[PDB]
Amino acid sequence: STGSATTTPIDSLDDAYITPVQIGTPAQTLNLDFDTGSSDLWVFSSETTASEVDGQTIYTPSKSTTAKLLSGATWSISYGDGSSSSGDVYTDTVSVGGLTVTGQAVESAKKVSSSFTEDSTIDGLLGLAFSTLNTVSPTQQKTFFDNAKASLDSPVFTADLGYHAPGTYNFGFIDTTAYTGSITYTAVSTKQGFWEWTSTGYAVGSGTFKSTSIDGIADTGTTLLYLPATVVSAYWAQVSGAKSSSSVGGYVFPCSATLPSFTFGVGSARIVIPGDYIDFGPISTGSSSCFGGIQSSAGIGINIFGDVALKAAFVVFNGATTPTLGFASK
Ligand SMILES: Nc1cnc2c(c1)COCC2
Ligand SMILES: Nc1cnc2c(c1)COCC2
């Protein structure tokens, strides 16, 4: 089998991407944030505290003839921005782009934190990291990809995120029309439960490439590119007036600037992020200070190849017995 679904930016900045997902019988369609940095499929629901729902579409398990309470199971998760959610668990039928899994754990939110309530465009998350990170207790549950894998034509999914435009998540096949050149594959460590790999270096604009190993994660659920402070300083030094602002929480730059590109290495290959992808707009409405898309990972403990990096490539998440990652230009 295969599946193919369009993913759409939630706003004019590409802060995140939503993909429609069918849950239950009859289908209830929710728009979920596909997140290769976590491993829980959770949704706003009829159980979510009413004051914490503001415009999202909810899953109502009592209206699904295939929903079953997973007795005793609870979940609770926290993300890198300090946001969080928790609740109980149903199993139900879940379909993405024509690909169907029966018996998928659907984690129903009883509580969500303010940043989720405040974002009316995201109805939940669909985790695509390794199932060892799944938070369900006392019986850990499998991701949608892990449950689908045996039925797929090939044990892979691909992320093709757009810049200010829709893109595609495919399951079970590699669309050879969606990229240019060849796909370069690179090793993955699953030891932290992430799609963790090692970039071979970087370049700033037209500058010379610096060969240096940069361990990080491919994370569709993180907006920006978080790299070591040395790398980030070298990038922003090429932008007149750019500076790190403790009050704003990162590097800012004059909105009048034209930003240089940033290149990262994948083996001997190179992925170029155009400068415009690094512009995240005014820090507050009407300001002439703009927020940068490349930020320091120093206070995180891990480097993160988030959407800013991934949307410059066609990315293969290869879930074969030994997982690997593939990157192609497009
Ligand atoms: N830092 C961070 C990483 N991933 C996510 C969030 C924050 C919040 O939305 C869910 C996914
Ligand atoms: N994506 C994104 C993340 N953080 C910030 C902005 C955008 C805007 O400026 C303030 C801080």
PDB file of C-alpha atoms in Angstrom, residues 7-9 13-14 17 159-168 277 307 310-313 330:
ATOM      1  CA  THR A   7       0.667  19.505   3.771  1.00  0.00           C
ATOM      2  CA  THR A   8      -0.112  23.240   4.013  1.00  0.00           C
ATOM      3  CA  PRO A   9       1.594  26.066   5.956  1.00  0.00           C
ATOM      4  CA  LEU A  13       5.651  32.548   7.757  1.00  0.00           C
ATOM      5  CA  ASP A  14       5.523  28.736   7.466  1.00  0.00           C
ATOM      6  CA  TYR A  17       2.395  22.683   8.444  1.00  0.00           C
ATOM      7  CA  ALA A 159       8.670  14.972   3.549  1.00  0.00           C
ATOM      8  CA  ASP A 160       8.505  17.583   0.773  1.00  0.00           C
ATOM      9  CA  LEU A 161       7.690  20.840   2.571  1.00  0.00           C
ATOM     10  CA  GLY A 162       7.006  23.981   0.574  1.00  0.00           C
ATOM     11  CA  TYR A 163       8.334  27.517   0.980  1.00  0.00           C
ATOM     12  CA  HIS A 164       5.246  29.679   1.372  1.00  0.00           C
ATOM     13  CA  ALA A 165       3.351  26.969  -0.499  1.00  0.00           C
ATOM     14  CA  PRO A 166       1.828  23.508  -0.008  1.00  0.00           C
ATOM     15  CA  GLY A 167       3.904  20.347  -0.149  1.00  0.00           C
ATOM     16  CA  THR A 168       3.501  16.602   0.322  1.00  0.00           C
ATOM     17  CA  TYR A 277      13.782  31.101   3.808  1.00  0.00           C
ATOM     18  CA  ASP A 307      11.478  23.230   8.728  1.00  0.00           C
ATOM     19  CA  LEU A 310      14.021  20.528   5.567  1.00  0.00           C
ATOM     20  CA  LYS A 311      11.871  22.577   3.199  1.00  0.00           C
ATOM     21  CA  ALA A 312      14.959  23.203   1.047  1.00  0.00           C
ATOM     22  CA  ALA A 313      15.132  19.439   0.347  1.00  0.00           C
ATOM     23  CA  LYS A 330      14.428  19.991  -5.558  1.00  0.00           C
TER      24      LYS A 330
END
